[PDB]
Write a protein that binds this ligand. Sequence first.
Ligand SMILES: OC[C@H]1O[C@H](O[C@H]2[C@H](O)[C@@H](O)[C@@H](O)O[C@@H]2CO)[C@H](O)[C@@H](O)[C@@H]1O
Length: 500
Amino acid sequence: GKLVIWINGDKGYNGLAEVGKKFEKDTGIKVTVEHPDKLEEKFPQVAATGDGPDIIFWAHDRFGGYAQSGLLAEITPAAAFQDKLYPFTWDAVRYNGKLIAYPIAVEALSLIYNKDLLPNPPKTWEEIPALDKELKAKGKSALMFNLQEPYFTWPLIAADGGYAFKYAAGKYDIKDVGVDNAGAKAGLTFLVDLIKNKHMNADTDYSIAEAAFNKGETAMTINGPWAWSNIDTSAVNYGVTVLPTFKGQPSKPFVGVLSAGINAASPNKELAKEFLENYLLTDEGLEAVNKDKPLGAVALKSYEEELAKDPRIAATMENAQKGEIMPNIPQMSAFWYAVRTAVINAASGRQTVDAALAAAQTNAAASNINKAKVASVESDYSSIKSAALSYYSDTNKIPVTPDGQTGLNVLETYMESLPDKADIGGEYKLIKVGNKLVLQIGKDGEGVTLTEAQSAKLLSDIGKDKIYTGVTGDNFGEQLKDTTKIDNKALYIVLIDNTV
Ligand SMILES: OC[C@H]1O[C@H](O[C@H]2[C@H](O)[C@@H](O)[C@@H](O)O[C@@H]2CO)[C@H](O)[C@@H](O)[C@@H]1O
């Protein structure tokens, strides 16, 4: 018997491992705590039937996907243990009538601010620019937070009626997506403008935002309870308060319930159930984790009764109140992928706010991310093909990317938006292969990635004798099949069969 545990790297994995040590001491079973980057993505991908944990910790939104893919063991705690946790926390880990994980703690973002630099934190996003201009004169800045992750930007962007999927009594409608709207356009636009007006950098991420606030260089940050530990160790006298409003609308953070599920592939399901019920989810167990990095509002009633007295904890639940506990359906991964792409695309200037959000609304509504990427590539393909034929028609010349270069700058004056790279991976390029104009996607080592399912859909939607997986001079290699998978390789789609 053994237990490998996964938890994210911003959580108290050191404390959790202490708890691990106790369980080992009493049972002789080794507990290993790991914190691999992007664990919530690696888990269905390892899967987790290989180099995967017996127990996985994440916010509950990821778990419906897991359950649906059959990766999770059904948990069956007795009524007496269920009694120990707040009813609403079990609802976060209910999926299709079954319990599929143990709830641990309630996570909501708050505004964290420096009382010395900013004794009165702004109520509204709208005052951040002026606040920044003034702090800049002091060698400081107003706000830094992790821009790269939509978790952090969603509260602003969804403030005015935003949502992932509609909960019509009594179910989520997976084609009814609430990313795009007037509040989101205005919200996302505000972040882009902060960037353009040098009140924020497009590249600011978790580590950068955190180091800057804890070193007293930025007056405000946006984070969860797990971040308080490191600020305690710093010289900063910080307050934790309500997220700013925007256009009168309160921020609507998506609220996470940190949860521990059990790997369906684990031979150690029962030791895992013992570890979680009788070591972690006790006053001692959660205390050891919380001591390391604060959990937020824990699901355990007895310990939460004490934590609820913390004003930082009250601020958290105030933010959680104004927001919404995430859905846990499989389609959330597509939702987050959608918003992630949209914000980064907008913040860097790769799309307009409107185009970025129109795309997210589309991406979000797709079955899965892989399907979404293929649909996207079809759209690029369709636009480039049209443009290449329009070009060929107006100039009497076959459009081709210049030797030793990439990009479709050629049809630059023939398209609305110029596609740069495929969402399946790989920079776009126009080449000839004999008497054919061909769209090449990527290079060997910097190309596309495809599952069989993606391949099948592409072949069906684009047609036969179009898609090839290699080229030798002026002839084609193997054509794509519905069974082929591709790992980081170039791809080729004919645009014109006949350039006679
Ligand atoms: O940004 C998308 C991301 O949001 C949430 O992830 C949170 C997590 O819940 C927090 O505990 C903390 O680790 O920050 C993460 C954001 O970096 C969702 O749970 C996750 O599924 C989603 O991809």
